[PDB]
Design a protein around this ligand. Structure first.
Ligand SMILES: [Ca+2]
Ligand SMILES: [Ca+2]
Lengths: 40, 517, 484, 484, 518
């Protein structure tokens, strides 16, 4: 349970699980997973 | 709408004061919608992939449009080459009248190839192509030796009323294939490729029409053996005619030799008129009269008709005994005493004369790519293709062609797999007429994209074609890559769009008018 | 949105799913032969349903002897463009031993002018073994640059459905079978193109000529790869010369030892570091000894100083290769190293878990539905992997491979799984009818006839395609014939 | 309930992601070696977890000296079937001269029986440089032609990912590295099949022997391209031999200029266009000279009038090759031209952006994780691209490439990043433990053992995979070991 | 606040045909609206990069096409970063064992805002004080390098006894061949920023070491190598040394090379080997060996030395060593020329190189060399003469991190071809006599704008090394054959509004920092 990279999955996999399943949406989570953000 | 920014450190990553990565995924300016948020690159790409030339001057181009939005590559370099070539009739057909109502035919083959743009061949006379006519053509493109020394876009006679030239893509072509300085990238994809064939004609005699149609072609790596002590080769003497001088007097044969090393051919005994390559293998461009004789020191041992002909330190002398206004007889002569002379019958503007040679030179193995020359027939295309379009050049101020991910439903990464010596086969065409060694075009062929051709017909000697091409390639750089310094993260997968595109494309004809550019 | 798919995309569905039943269930709608992946801007989709009557190698077609004797017959189906499938049979229900196996293989790779077996007709290849090939008419029809020539820039099987109906009198309506799909991609092992001379090999298979004194006569089919087709005619003795339509040199003959066949060399030849003939010599091939088991042969020519040639070939199994060099030239043309789908009823089980097996009595035969197994999408299979495939397999020694352009030359579907079906307890008094609904979709480059049929590639019907290979997946590509 | 992937997906996802944390985090569950793309009827998924402790070349795995000396070690993981990666090294702290790297490569392009190297044992190709080949056991274990002879049709790497733990005592952690995934694809440059005489070549790589007279005694690796393997042994002189296991001829031996080993020809051989020796004739090999940088080798044939060989070879440099020609028959096999993933710290950092460098001390090693980097979807490498790994690179000229079936013989996983991890300035006294969690999915054609656990393909779970794919294109694939 | 501007593809009023017009579109400008300005990321990004070329990226400030100086000067431009990372290591004397409580080295770096070239290394194993002789021996060397690309591999190179240096180039730019057959480069160019972090790769404890860094400007004033025809005069150098693991007393290595003379494949004719060849276009070769060993090749062009005809287009000249000691060596070059003379010459291994003046029967391309006054080498010469420097113990700083900046000019005047050359180095106390004639030395264009730097390290345990993670940004204007024209497009807009800061900011501080602040 040291995997960071792994956490960075279950985090998004986590979302996905209750996410609209849109591949567009997937992009969303997939960036959130990397912990990205909307700057300003 | 809004901008996105990913962190160097992944949630939790604990880097040192100089660790991490050295990059910073350029921000995401993906635009927004009720259902999707493609990034300007994703978007730009869509339009570019769709209407390359237009979408740009259309203003709809933007962001990493030269990158494909299918979030496949973790990192990738990419760009677009917009080389603009002006194709125009080869023969300065001298006319006495004030109105040389002459017309010429011309056709272009587009290959979604890494370094190659498209091919083109015209007929000074508007005559169509004959089988054997066509064949010579073909066998010529297979026999082209130091092909690189042709990218200049220069015209080249192969048939009587026929010439042909090949156009590279300025930079990718500007990336050599030698072990010393330049080697390609690990692989790539033709992100989108379009060409406009502007009908540059005097708005006086704007006659003519053209047919365009996309045809997919996948290459076949019919590879060449790696030789050691000796290597098999082919001595080529494609006899031709002096674009100006008297056939029945002077000939213009091109003389190359498949695996034998490039060695300067200086005309010694004769009248004069030579132009040798710079390619790695030995080839020559020379025109002259009978008595004339060129020379050169044979880089390596050479056999032929069984018996040895030359040795490293030998000096070969090539001449021509007879020059009918259409046929040509020639002689090849070795220093090496005990050897006998070589002679052979050719026919300028016709097939080449082959000479199963053998060169005392280690031979790197390299594949040759067996590629079916797309319907070149005035009217074959018209048949095997329903999605072809066609109008008069007058109307459609030219032709607009947009290639597309034709072969694979999705965008694979055509890599080194299919790379090599283009060697075109076709129906009715005999390969026996195919030159040996690694000659012909050499390039990585985007096996995903749609190859495609467009023949112009019934135009005027005066009318010329400005081919504005927009080639968009993306690939992964390895080493020595003079480009690796441009690669960033690969486009994000926005299939939402992508699919649409694919549909359109499919749904559409990759051909349009240079007025819909 | 209803998820409305073109009625023709639906056709494709069932067709892919159940290429045979779909037709029968009328569910065969629209131009079902085009793949709804919305890929091609245009394309030609075709579907040949060629039917073959498989009889037991020796058993007549006329009279059906109710022997109450049996025979093992298996078929290997390949998603090859024109090649429908291959079938091999043992007139004694026997097992496929190694040599037999290897011989079988060996043969297929050394099949010179393979077009010579376009005819479903059998061909002994071992002591009690025969094999034959089944081409897909319409495609096989596509003469590779002859007089009548059309062409396709690339294609992809849209589905393949073969159903080996167990045509056996209910009387001895016995035996069983095992079917299974095994995906195989080919590798392009190249046959270097050459000039003044071209290396090659002179093969000479030998085996008893059904209906001739076993120990006396022997039917043999000897060929010579780069050597251009030569017209052989018996020169002196007991008749028995069947020639080839082929482009290279091959001929099947039979006769007394003293019998002699001869033809003129259409190009200079070399054998055992030595010369053998000029482009005009009169080559003479005959036999020295004929054993119901073995056979010695020897060929010579009018070439002055031309030594003779001699080697032996134990009748029924393998060929006597002869390293040769021909005076003509070769093309780049390469063979296709292709793994050979488990030929033993053994491995098939021990390797394919989604394989099936029923008795031919209940399961009126065996019906298999080929499917895109190779890659998750319907990639286009073009030129890239076309060539004379030569199957390799454990045990099989490449040594036995010819040297020229041999074997079944065709294109392989870089996607569809190949499948094999072994019938075991069949009664010679039974024949396996083979319904073959196989439909490909490709693109034309040059031709005078096919073009006019090319329209638009089926629209991207993502939703269907989706489930499509989803089902095929969780499903055994094998099925009870009667379930077609 | 948006979607419910079965464990085998999750477990997979997490693995094709953090193949270490997956397991470590117990997140790896279900039959995870199968890609939930749902493309197979049946498939055998598998995960080989080799843990090799890549110790410095000249080091005692026993009483390691707390030296404080350095050494470069670059790992170039390839998504090959039974090939984990290659290990580059350099005891003397020296850069990779073109000479050097060109020597390196050629070594790997001319490795006679690469199998003889599976031991991953160190091999000195250059004065201070070594290499070695670590393999994915279990697969490699399945003997190529085998005894139970299990044969896999097609496969596909489902997830590479391996960590290169920086095994070093706080005393000496002086170390820093940097990885990066660079995709690679093999272009099948085919080796032709010939008949009576097939060409090949004779290689001889000379170098000094560990703990031996750097000018009095030198070790070479003499081999022959298409030559059938034959046993050698010192005949007269200072002992020192190591025979090959492969089907071709090669051997490693140490000794002085007086030392002479010999073996008997397995078949005819021509050399310098001259019959060097026939079947019987016993060939001898010795050294006219021996220094610290050069060696004159010379092979004497038992043949009568058989002129012998004499050759200069700078030990530590390339391999001096003598074109050959054996009387054996050869099957045409495929050599695979393959770009060599940037071998230089800079070459890598400037051309690849998604690289990630670290100080070993802080980053407890390195952890790279490959991923389907070519096909946007998991196609299925099979026979498709299998052969002799023969690499090139900028600079490298094939002028020094072996004519025979050499190099690393395997199948390169078409679509999948091959990566590189360079460890610079590592303590002599430190090693790299390499636990790779490699997994693949394939199909069985013939075998007796593998086709048992062959089951159904993974259930097509897009979203899952979809995401997985997003994260990849998204990531670096190179992380602090502390992140596995 | 955010904003996105779009420059139409047309101009107000332009009536444009479909087919034609402009072929390139303008990448959309994204501006960060500020209460006083709204630069585009390609600015900020730059800004930051230019300012902290590493920490700006590690931090998350490297936005857009930051490799483009925002000063609306170029219409079109090519931008690109290069982050080569070499791990300069101690050189090799021999597997000569190594105790931790023992040996260590001194290694210095000189970084020049040169287009292709990255930085020049230099180290002394036994840890030495740069003696005058040592210096010259060095400089003379760098200069007399024939096919400078020959070592672009960033491989160590000896010269003085126990002294080695090396050259590291911008892997991608070095990758772009010069004056090659059909090869050439960009039109102009200008470093957009460039910093280097010499991470201190040292064992946690043997953290011993101290380094100094400082920015010192240097501009190349060019001197020319005149063209000629019948024969182009030049000279052949031959330096000496003892290969590694080599009996220094009787096995010497030499960097024998002739200048205007064409590379001619050198081949060992007799005796032990020890011979390396050069890819470059000029005759250069590296051989070593027992005294009486012989080398050779076929003299490509008419050679005349010692005022005497020495060779012809075909003669085969060979080089053998008369007497080789563990310090000095006497060599001999013999012509296969009918009654030619012979060249007996001797050189001191660890120092200097024998220049035998020659004249080659070959035409020459006039190409000038750049008189670039080499910067500091004297650890204390810096400290004293350059105020804005910073010294640190590696123990208390993971290393050094320097960052340059247009110092030579307050503006960013594109430093085109105007100063291209195989720059030989100039230094206080160096005889330009040791200089090689012909066009040798490292070839390249020098950013006639940026400050060059130097960063000497001492007391670095042999076992400790230095990872030199660099970040060289630059933008030029491509012309023809450029393998980059594609990556070209619209120039950066003028953000002097910001630029200014950056300038007066840099100057505000040193260019030297801690390798833990990047
Ligand atoms: Ca593919
Ligand atoms: Ca100025």
């Amino acid at each position: 349970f040291a995997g960071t990279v792994s956490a960075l999955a279950s985090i998004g996999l986590g979302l996905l699980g209750k996410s609209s399943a849109t591949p567009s949406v997937i992009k969303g989570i997939a960036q959130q997973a990397v912990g990205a953000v909307q700057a300003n | 709408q809004a901008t996105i920014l990913k962190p160097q450190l992944l949630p939790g990553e604990s880097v040192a004061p100089s660790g991490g990565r050295g990059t910073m995924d350029p921000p995401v300016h993906e635009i927004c919608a009720q259902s999707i948020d493609p990034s300007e690159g994703a978007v730009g790409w869509f339009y570019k992939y769709m209407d390359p030339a237009g979408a740009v001057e259309s203003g709809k181009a933007l962001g990493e449009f030269s990158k494909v939005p299918d979030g496949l590559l973790r990192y990738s370099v990419d760009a677009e080459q917009r080389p603009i070539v002006t194709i125009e009739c080869p023969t300065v057909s001298e006319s006495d009248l004030p109105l040389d109502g002459k017309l010429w035919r011309v056709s272009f083959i587009s290959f979604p190839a890494f370094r190659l743009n498209f091919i083109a061949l015209a007929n000074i006379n508007n005559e169509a192509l004959t089988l054997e006519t066509r064949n010579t053509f073909i066998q010529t493109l297979n026999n082209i030796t130091n092909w690189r020394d042709l990218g200049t876009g220069q015209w080249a006679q192969f048939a009587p009323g026929w010439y042909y030239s090949i156009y590279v893509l300025p930079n990718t072509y500007a990336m050599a294939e030698i072990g010393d300085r330049t080697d390609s990238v690990t692989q790539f994809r033709k992100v989108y490729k379009g060409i406009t064939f502007e009908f540059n004609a005097p708005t006086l005699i704007d006659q003519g029409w053209w047919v365009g149609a996309h045809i997919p072609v996948k290459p076949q790596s019919e590879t060449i053996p790696a030789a050691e002590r000796f290597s098999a080769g082919s001595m080529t003497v494609s006899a031709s005619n002096a674009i100006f001088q008297p056939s029945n007097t002077v000939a213009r044969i091109v003389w190359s030799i498949t695996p034998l090393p490039v060695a300067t051919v200086a005309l010694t005994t004769g009248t004069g008129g030579t132009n040798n390559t710079s390619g790695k293998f030995f080839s020559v461009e020379i025109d002259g009269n009978v008595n004339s004789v060129w020379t050169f020191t044979a880089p390596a041992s050479i056999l032929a008709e069984g018996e040895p002909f030359a040795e490293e330190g030998d000096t070969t002398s090539f001449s021509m005994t007879t020059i009918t206004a259409d046929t040509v007889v020639y002689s090849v002569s070795s220093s090496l005493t005990g050897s006998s002379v070589i002679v052979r019958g050719v026919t300028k503007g016709s097939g080449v004369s082959i000479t199963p040679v053998t060169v005392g030179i280690d031979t790197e193995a390299v594949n040759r790519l067996s590629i079916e020359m797309p319907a070149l027939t005035t009217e074959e295309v018209t048949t095997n293709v329903p999605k072809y379009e066609q109008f008069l050049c007058k109307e459609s101020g030219g032709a607009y062609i947009v290639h597309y991910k034709m072969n694979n439903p999705v965008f694979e990464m055509t890599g080194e797999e299919n790379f090599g010596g283009f060697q075109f086969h076709y129906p009715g065409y005999d390969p026996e007429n195919n030159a040996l060694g690694l000659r012909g075009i050499v390039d990585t062929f985007e096996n995903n994209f749609s190859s495609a051709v467009v023949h112009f017909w019934g135009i005027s000697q005066s009318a010329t074609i400005v081919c504005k091409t927009y080639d968009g390639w993306e690939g992964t750089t390895n080493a020595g890559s003079t480009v690796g310094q441009f690669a960033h993260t690969g486009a994000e997968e926005e299939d939402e769009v992508v699919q649409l595109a694919n549909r359109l494309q499919m749904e559409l004809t990759g051909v349009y008018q240079a007025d819909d550019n």
